[PDB]
Amino acid sequence: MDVFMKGLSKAKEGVVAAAEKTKQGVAEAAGKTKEGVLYVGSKTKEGVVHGVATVAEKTKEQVTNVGGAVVTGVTAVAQKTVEGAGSIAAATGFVK
Amino acid sequence: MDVFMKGLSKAKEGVVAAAEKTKQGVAEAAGKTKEGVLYVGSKTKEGVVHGVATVAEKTKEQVTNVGGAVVTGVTAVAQKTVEGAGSIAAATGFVK
Amino acid sequence: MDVFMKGLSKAKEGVVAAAEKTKQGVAEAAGKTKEGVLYVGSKTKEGVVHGVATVAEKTKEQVTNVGGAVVTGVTAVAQKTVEGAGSIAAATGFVK
Amino acid sequence: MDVFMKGLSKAKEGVVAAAEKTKQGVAEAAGKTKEGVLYVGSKTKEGVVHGVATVAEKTKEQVTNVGGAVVTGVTAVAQKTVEGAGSIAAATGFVK
Amino acid sequence: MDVFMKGLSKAKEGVVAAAEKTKQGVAEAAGKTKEGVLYVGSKTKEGVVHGVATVAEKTKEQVTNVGGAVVTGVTAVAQKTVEGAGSIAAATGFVK
Amino acid sequence: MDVFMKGLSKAKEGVVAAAEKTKQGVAEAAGKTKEGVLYVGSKTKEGVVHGVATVAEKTKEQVTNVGGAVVTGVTAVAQKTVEGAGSIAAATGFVK
Amino acid sequence: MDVFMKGLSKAKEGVVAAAEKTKQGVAEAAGKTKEGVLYVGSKTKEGVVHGVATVAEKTKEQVTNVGGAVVTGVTAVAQKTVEGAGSIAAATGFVK
Amino acid sequence: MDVFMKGLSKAKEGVVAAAEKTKQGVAEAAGKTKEGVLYVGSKTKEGVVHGVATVAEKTKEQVTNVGGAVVTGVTAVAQKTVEGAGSIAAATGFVK
Amino acid sequence: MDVFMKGLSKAKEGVVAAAEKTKQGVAEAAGKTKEGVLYVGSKTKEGVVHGVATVAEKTKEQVTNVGGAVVTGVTAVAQKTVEGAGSIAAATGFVK
Amino acid sequence: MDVFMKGLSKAKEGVVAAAEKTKQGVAEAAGKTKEGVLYVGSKTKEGVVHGVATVAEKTKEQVTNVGGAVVTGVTAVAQKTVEGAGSIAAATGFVK
């Protein structure tokens, strides 16, 4: 069972260059990501929201958030005169 | 069972260059992503929302959000004079 | 069972370059993506919304959002003078 | 079982270049995407919305959204003087 | 069972370079990520929100957030004249 | 991948009986048999005879056998008043 | 990957009887048999006979056997008044 | 990966009877058998006979056997008035 | 990875009877058997016979056996008035 | 990884009976058997016969056996009026 290899697997005489995802100037709220996840035989239960019972009587104002994740803020980003953040991979093999 | 290889698998005499997804100036709210996920024989249950029972009587104002993820803010991005964020892969092999 | 290869599989004497999806100036709300997902024998249950029972009597105003993901904010992006974000792959092999 | 190859599979003496989809100046709301998904024997259940029961009596105003994903915001994008975002793949092999 | 290798596995005579994801000017709220997670035989239960019972009577103002994670602040980022943050990998082998 | 089932597979409400091959009064020499053999991806090499170089000069008598299997004996069988050797399978289900 | 089941697999509500091969009065020399053999990805080499170089000069008599298996004896069987050797399977289920 | 089950696998509500191969009055020489053998990824080398170099000069008699197995004896079997050796399986379930 | 089960595996509510191979009045010479053998990743080398160099000059008599196993004897069996040797399995479940 | 179970594994509410192989009046010479053998990652080398160099000059008689196992005797068996040797398994469960 061979999974998520980067580079030579069961292999020979090889040259491999792998970059990887860059991020610059990114604003995220309540995001979910899953990379390289393996489930074998497993039993899994995620994110269930059950039985929210918001009630109100006669109130003048009312706000309610129920979530696996709640963001109500300000998440600004500002940049002036910025360079770089790049990812570089260089591989050299078997030259003469 | 061989899955998600990058590069040589069961292979030989090879030169491989792989870049990977760049991001610049990206704003995300409540996003979900899944890359390189493998399920074998597994049993899985995700994101279920059950039994939300919002009620109101005689209220003057009422706001309610129920979610696997809730965003109500400001998530701006601003940039001036920005460079880079590139991903670069270079691979050189077996030259003469 | 061989899946999601990039590059040589069961192969030889090969030169491969692969770029990958760039993003610049992208704004996303409540998005879902699935890349490179494999299900074998698995039993899966996703995103179920069950039994939402929003009620109101005599209220003056009322707003309710029930969702796998809820966004009600502002997610703007602004850019001036921006460069790069490119993904580059270069592969050179077996030159004379 | 061989699926989603990019590059040489069961093959030899090959030169391959593959770019990948770029995005610039894209605004998305509640989108869903599925690339490279494989189901073998699996039993799957997605997106089900069941039993929504919105009610109102004598209310003055009322808004309700129930969704696999709900967006009520502003998701603008603005750009001036922007370059790049291109994806490039170059492959050279077996030159004389 | 061989999982998440980077570099040679069951392999020989190889040159491998691998970069890794850079981040610059990123602001996140309530985010979740999962990389290189392996479940074998296991039974797991995550994120469950159960039995939230927000109530109000005659109140003049009321705010309530119930979440696996709650953010209500300001998470700004600002930059002027910034460089670097790049990840670099260089691999050279078998040169004559 | 389901192979060599005897009985119910992915099935229900079933009654199955299966006898299996009997042998009585059988004499065998150098026999080869293969039942229920499965090869997946495998590379196999069987029975090769290479480079036999029998020589004789001026001999009076000479015998030579070279084989994957050599029998030069006597393999008789005798029987008087013999019974049985039968294979029996009986299956009864869901009777009223 | 499900192989060589006898009985219920992925199945329910079933009654199965399986007998299996009987042998009586059997004489075997140098025989080969393979039942329920599975090869996955394996590399196998069997029975090779290489470089036998039998030589003789001026001998009066000479006998030579070279084999993966050699039998030159007597392997007789005799029986008088013999019973049984039967294999019996009986399965009864869900009777009223 | 499920192999060589006898009985219920991933199954329920089942009744199974399995007999198994009987032998009575059997004479075997140099036999080979393989039941329920599983190879995964393995590399195997069996039975190789290499470089036998039988020589003779001027001998009056000469016998030579070279083999993975050699039998030159007498392996008789005799029986009078014999019973049994049967294999019996009985399974009873869910009777009213 | 589930192999060689007898009885319920991943299963419930079941009745299983398994007999097993009987032998009566059996004579064997140099036999080989393999039941329930599992190889994972392993590298194995069996039975190799290499470089047998039988020589003779002017001898009056000469016998030579070279083998993974050599039998030159007498292996008789005799029986009068014999009973039994049977294998019996009885399984009863869930009777009313 | 679950191997060679007899009875319930990962299972419940079950009745299992299993007999095991009987032997009566059996005579064996130089035999090899392998039951329930598991190799994981291992490297193994067995039975190698190397460099046998039998020589003779002018001898009147000569006998030579070189083997992983050598038998040259008498291994007879005789029986009169014999009973039993049977293996019995009985299993009863959940009777009303």
From Swiss-Prot, chains A, B, C, D, E, F, G, H, I, J:
> Which compartments does it reside in?
Cytoplasm; Membrane; Nucleus; Synapse
Q: How is it modified after translation?
A: Phosphorylated, predominantly on serine residues. Phosphorylation by CK1 appears to occur on residues distinct from the residue phosphorylated by other kinases.
Keywords of the record: Acetylation, Alzheimer disease, Amyloid, Cell projection, Copper, Cytoplasm, Disease variant, Membrane, Metal-binding, Neurodegeneration, Nucleus, Parkinson disease, Parkinsonism, Phosphoprotein, Repeat, Secreted, Synapse, Ubl conjugation
- Reported impact of residue 57 to K: Increases oligomerization
Q: Name one GO biological process term.
A: response to type II interferon
Q: Name one GO cellular component term.
A: postsynapse
Tissue distribution: Highly expressed in presynaptic terminals in the central nervous system. Expressed principally in brain.
Outcome of mutating residue 39 to F, per the record?
No effect on osmotic stress-induced phosphorylation
Q: Where are the sequence repeats?
A: 20-30, 31-41, 42-56, 57-67
- Which positions carry N-acetylmethionine? 1
Q: Where is this region: 4 X 11 AA tandem repeats of [EGS]-K-T-K-[EQ]-[GQ]-V-X(4)?
A: 20-67
Any one GO MF term held by the record is:
protein kinase inhibitor activity
Subunit organization: Soluble monomer. Homotetramer. A dynamic intracellular population of tetramers and monomers coexists normally and the tetramer plays an essential role in maintaining homeostasis. Interacts with UCHL1. Interacts with phospholipase D and histones. Interacts (via N-terminus) with synphilin-1/SNCAIP; this interaction promotes formation of SNCA inclusions in the cytoplasm. Interacts with CALM1. Interacts with STXBP1; this interaction controls SNCA self-replicating aggregation. Interacts with SNARE components VAMP2 and SNAP25; these interactions allows SNARE complex assembly and integrity.
Please give the family membership noted in the entry: Belongs to the synuclein family.
Please explain the role this protein plays, according to its UniProt record: Neuronal protein that plays several roles in synaptic activity such as regulation of synaptic vesicle trafficking and subsequent neurotransmitter release. Participates as a monomer in synaptic vesicle exocytosis by enhancing vesicle priming, fusion and dilation of exocytotic fusion pores. Mechanistically, acts by increasing local Ca(2+) release from microdomains which is essential for the enhancement of ATP-induced exocytosis.
Q: What is this protein called?
A: Alpha-synuclein
Q: Which gene encodes it?
A: SNCA
From-to range in the entire protein, with total length: 1 to 96 of 140
